[PDB]
């Protein structure tokens, strides 16, 4: 007989929070981790159970709200709105109180100690949850890929990070994070459509430019040729209908946006590209391990959904790495929910349940307990 | 409610049956059945043993050249698992036969079996002292011949793997 | 008669173990005698099957352990982790039951004699071995070279021994040691690679510099001659590729490393080099027999496998030895195993049944049985 | 006229360059030895001018230059950019021509003959200098502590050297190095500030982190004691004002940075700390000379300007060394420039007239003169 113990799974990722139940292979809810408090000039009355709108609602009713970001760098800083975000997720989007269901969170590479201890607090206090865990993003993706050593290049809407893995443990002093993310791709994608005269500036147009990002974009190989091909052949130009039947067309901008991870300096950053960041993080690991990292580059994160990226990374790493090395890029099928698909299956394992990180080991061991079950 | 699925110590018992060279009359002629599988349980919370799709010892002196040749095309494509091997290799410095852990993880296996058999991978490896070499397989071809095990033990053993050259 | 046990031949060495079967052509297990314990702790209960990581299992543990050798001289300094070395050799590296199969052992030149009685105890108590034997290492390689009188210079793992021998009897007044060998010269090679601005500092990098040393170092035919040749010939220096595809040039360091064994003052020591400890051990032997020892100077141990060393050994001592004398340096091909091959034969001679100490002779004659029967 | 005695002194240090006139109290310019190679022509110059930009110029042009450090390991690993550091030091920063002025240079510990020779060559063949000298900076800082014998820890930004000295001569069999230095402290400091969400990624923000190093950082007298006191107060924390007019405040992270010197494991090195390496360096010095080194551990260089470091070292080396010995940390009063100030005094002593290598002492023996005249 199978256990009734269905756990809740929440990925905090970067930018986009993603949630569902353990046993589902895809999230039931996905939204941007944004919150908006009213301004006292033009304050609304009769809204929610709280002082601030969250997610899509905060962008659906603009101008009057002063928007605030509770996460940036992929790391949690605010908790007074993050504990609203989780509540609105459980009690309004997923339709349950989490009091029967163990709850698994995802950790970002190089997350401060105490943020796991605050994750133990709010689950057992604020939300009344019976048990928890916290698992680091890059291991969840590499284990779900079916590998045991290599480097994960992960790329979401808040940050992009390169994480070397050895046996299953991440080498911490070898990690790199690039600032360049799906955020800055949206900043750029709006502006370069505006350079074609298709001006997009509002919160309503931003999410259509995000819908275009998630549809029509791809990484170019050998950039100047793809630019010249678009500038001489409408074969690379593609059309889109805006919400009320008005039509646009996008070409160069479909790959000139994705290219900003290989050239951050095309938005304006001092930062080196994803291939250079991959090379510099491999070159910060030990002499005998580097061979297996060059040969095991895992692509992760929702911005690696673009065609041509692994195909391009094969060119870009062989321009940096010794030609005696034999560069395999591992591009998995799922990439958006990469860490959540690993986390969902981890959250269904009840192997050690009766002395774990349960709600009533807390009155004895306090919030310190979390680090004693972290491998 | 866990970090992974647990190792059940019968895997260490049937590993101990293969672990040592012993007394002539039966042990070497009967126990050294190379390519035994370690697999996920009924309840899905334990790694246990499954009787593998191999040959024993005296049967290598007949219609099959080696027991790896039995194994490498009697593995599941739609599942992951671990295999234990006992790889005979020459250099010309010495003649070894050393124990090897193999993680079979073909891309046609589902992400949840991949995630599960990845979770417990380090635990079973850190229990089996005297495993000298370990690797993971991902295609259907990186598995195939006996000499394709040899650079995974380290590229000094290229002279002879299971009696076959690399 | 034809279904009996092929006895083990396990040389205790000087920091490198060498162990095989009697009548087999080579040692099955060859590994460092190094042991380490953790400087910082994990949380994953049941994943450590031992307190101490022994052998190549120690070198494996990147910044976790502080490492130590229990056998610096070939004389054991810690017995209780050496008790684990043999246990790990049988129940891991050799893959045999020591309670089933007899074991022949070795003892280091001029060992404090209660050493071999605790060596007889541990075999017959802790490993419960059925039959045992012990030999001095320099009285193995001399008979493999077809001698009985001669002067064995064994430059082993950790200390270089000089053992003058006459008709199998190792002359006790004439023996000496130089406390330096092919272990401790490896870390000296790291410092003179640092003079070129190469980095090698970790235990992982040590094993590459160890590999560089055994493959590319040689003794110079004269130091200042080969230094003058190096200054007039850029072809002296040569390449080595690291396993990730980075490449460096190993230079005159190829002889500046080995030269420190002919000139210990280069690592800061008072002692004269292997030529002069050979001269001084021969010159401490009685009036004539100088004659037969100069004519039978055998090099033994791993640090004698360098090119130019037989050549160089003759070069120095012909200025020191009274000029009527005609020195013969013996330099056979298997130098590290000459001290094993003759033991493999000895431990499989059918007529040696009465020379083996069986388990029962440890009672009436006591633990001191080793001083009755074993050289 | 007669109170002025015209000479220059340029300390190369452990890669932290310091230069002025012989008779200056403190050096007239101080900077890191780095050359920025541009990716375009004319980026800081008109066409038909210098190829590559130095130090001050290099960090001033973020994103658009690539850097090389020529004197990385304190020994000169590259001449083609080190030649530009010296040329720019004279014909830019000091504002004087070397053809007229005797120039004293410093050498770092463990430097090859060929580098001492090639640096003696450059002074005459690239810079025309009337006279020169090569002093070992550790002995200049030992003499600035008013000593003949002692053990100097030089800790700049390139590498940290443990240099045991007896009566002006550094004991080469007992010199040690920890390749972790003030570079890697500056790099690690950016990461632990990014754990508090602060933007510290760029070259522009990095050189502000080098000021936070001087202004805000200190060594904790005991780490987890200072950690427990900081984690139970709001008093250890110190503020910093950014050059755009924004303000930040740093807590526990103020002592996470330089603890890396006592625990290299904070940046993943399995190496020993500044306490352990200095102790090991004294312990490899022979019999009775150790008592005189134990009482005279000199702290030297910029990384010895931190609060609590001398007090911490006085704890750590009295825990390491048997307390029947009377252990004392000492230092020069000023110590960040002491390495150069002792050169200023040396280059202005009128009796040093014969010890200066005058350019026609190159005529008789080429660059080998530095082994006869530079003690």
Describe this structure in words.
The structure is cut from a larger assembly and holds 3 copies of chain A (375 residues) and 1 copy of chain B (166 residues). With 375 residues, chain A is an alpha+beta fold. Helix content of chain A is 30%, strand content 19%. In chain A, strands 11, 12, 13, 14, 17 and 18 form a 6-stranded mixed β-sheet that branches. Chain A has a 5-stranded mixed β-sheet with strand order 3-2-1-9-10, with helices on both faces. In chain A, strands 5-4-6 form a 3-stranded antiparallel β-sheet. Chain A starts with 7 loop residues before the first strand and ends in a 10-residue tail after the last helix. With 166 residues, chain B is an alpha/beta fold. Chain B is built from 6 helices and 7 strands, in the order βααββαββααβαβ. Chain B has one domain (1-166). Chains in contact: A-B, A-C, A-D, B-C, C-D. The A-C interface holds A 286-291, 294, 321-325, 371-375 and C 43-44, 62, 202, 204-205, 207-208, 241-246. It is classed as contractile protein, cell cycle.
Structural class of chain B: alpha/beta
Number of domains of chain B: 1
Q: Major β-sheet of chain A, in short? A: 6 strands, mixed
Strand fraction band of chain B?
Answer: 15-25%
| N-to-C SSE string of chain B, H for helix and E for strand | EHHEEHEEHHEHE
Summarize the structure in short.
The structure is cut from a larger assembly and holds 3 copies of chain A (375 residues) and 1 copy of chain B (166 residues). Chain A contains 13 helices and 18 strands.
Task: Please tag this protein with its features.
part of a larger assembly; 4 chains; A: 375 residues; alpha+beta; Actin, Chain A, domain 4; 6-stranded mixed β-sheet; 5-stranded mixed β-sheet; globular; B: 166 residues; 7-stranded mixed β-sheet; contractile protein, cell cycle; actin filament binding; actin filament severing
List the helices and strands and how they pair.
The structure is cut from a larger assembly and holds three copies of chain A (375 residues) and one copy of chain B (166 residues).
Chain A: E1 8-11, E2 16-21, E3 29-32, E4 35-38, E5 53-54, H1 57-60, E6 65-68, E7 71-72, E8 75-76, H2 82-94, E9 103-107, H3 114-124, E10 132-136, H4 137-145, E11 150-155, E12 160-166, E13 169-170, E14 176-178, H5 182-195, H6 203-216, H7 224-230, E15 238-241, E16 247-250, H8 253-256, H9 274-282, H10 290-294, E17 297-300, H11 309-317, E18 329-330, H12 338-347, H13 362-365
Parallel strand pairs in A: 1-9, 9-10, 11-17, 17-18
Antiparallel strand pairs in A: 1-2, 2-3, 4-5, 4-6, 7-8, 11-12, 12-13, 12-14, 15-16
Helix pairs in contact in A: 4-12, 5-6
Chain B: E1 6-7, H1 10-19, H2 24-30, E2 37-40, E3 46-50, H3 68-71, E4 81-90, E5 95-104, H4 111-119, H5 121-125, E6 131-137, H6 150-153, E7 160-161
Parallel strand pairs in B: 1-3, 5-6
Antiparallel strand pairs in B: 2-3, 2-4, 4-5, 4-7
């Amino acid at each position: 007989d199978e256990d009734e113990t269905t756990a809740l799974v929440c990925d905090n990722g970067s930018g986009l929070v993603k949630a569902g139940f353990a046993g589902d292979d895809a999230p039931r809810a996905v939204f941007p981790s944004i919150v908006g408090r009213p301004r006292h000039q033009g304050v609304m009355v009769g809204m929610g159970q709280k002082d601030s709108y969250v997610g899509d609602e905060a962008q659906s009713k603009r101008g009057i709200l002063t928007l605030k970001y509770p996460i940036e760098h992929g790391i949690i800083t605010n908790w007074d709105d993050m504990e609203k975000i989780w509540h609105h997720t459980f009690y309004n989007e997923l339709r349950v109180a989490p009091e029967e269901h163990p709850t698994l969170l995802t950790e970002a590479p190089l997350n401060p100690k105490a943020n796991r201890e605050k994750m133990t607090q709010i689950m057992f206090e604020t939300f009344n949850v019976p048990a928890m865990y916290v698992a680091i993003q890059a291991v969840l993706s590499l284990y779900a890929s079916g590998r045991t050593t290599g480097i994960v290049l992960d790329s979401g809407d808040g940050v992009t990070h390169n994480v070397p893995i050895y046996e299953g443990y991440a080498l911490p002093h070898a990690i790199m994070r690039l600032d360049l993310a799906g955020r800055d791709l949206t900043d750029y994608l709006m502006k370069i459509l505006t350079e074609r005269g298709y001006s997009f500036v509002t919160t309503a147009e931003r999410e259509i430019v995000r819908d275009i990002k998630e549809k029509l974009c791809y990484v170019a190989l050998d950039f100047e040729n793809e630019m010249a091909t678009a500038a001489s052949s409408s074969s690379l130009e593609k059309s889109y209908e805006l919400p009320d039947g008005q039509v646009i067309t996008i070409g160069n901008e479909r790959f000139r946006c994705p290219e900003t991870l290989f050239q951050p300096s095309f938005i304006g950053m001092e930062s080196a590209g994803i291939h250079e960041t991959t090379y510099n993080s491999i070159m910060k690991c030990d002499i005998d391990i580097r061979k297996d990292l060059y040969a095991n580059n895992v692509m992760s994160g929702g911005t690696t959904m673009y065609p041509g990226i692994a195909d391009r990374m094969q060119k870009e790493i062989t321009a940096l790495a010794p030609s005696t090395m034999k560069i395999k890029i591992i591009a998995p099928p799922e990439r958006k929910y990469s860490v959540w698909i690993g986390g969902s299956i981890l959250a269904s394992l009840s192997t050690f349940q009766q002395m774990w990180i349960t709600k009533q080991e807390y009155d004895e061991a306090g919030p310190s307990i979390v680090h004693r079950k972290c491998f | 409610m866990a970090s992974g699925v647990t190792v059940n110590d019968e895997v260490i018992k049937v590993f101990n049956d293969m672990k040592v060279r012993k007394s002539s009359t039966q042990e070497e002629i009967k126990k050294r059945k190379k390519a035994v599988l370690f697999c996920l349980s009924d309840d899905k919370r334990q790694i246990i043993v499954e009787e593998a799709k191999q040959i024993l010892v005296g049967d290598i002196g007949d219609t099959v050249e080696d027991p790896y040749t039995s194994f490498v095309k009697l593995l599941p494509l739609n599942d992951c698992r671990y295999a234990l091997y006992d790889a005979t290799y020459e250099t010309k410095e010495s003649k070894k036969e050393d124990l090897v852990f193999i993680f079979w993880a073909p891309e046609s296996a589902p992400l949840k079996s991949k995630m599960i058999y990845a979770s417990s991978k380090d635990a079973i490896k850190k229990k089996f002292t005297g495993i000298k070499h370990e690797w993971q397989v991902n295609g259907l071809d990186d598995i195939k011949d006996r000499s394709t095990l040899g650079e995974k033990l380290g590229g000094n053993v290229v002279v002879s793997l299971e009696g076959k050259p690399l």
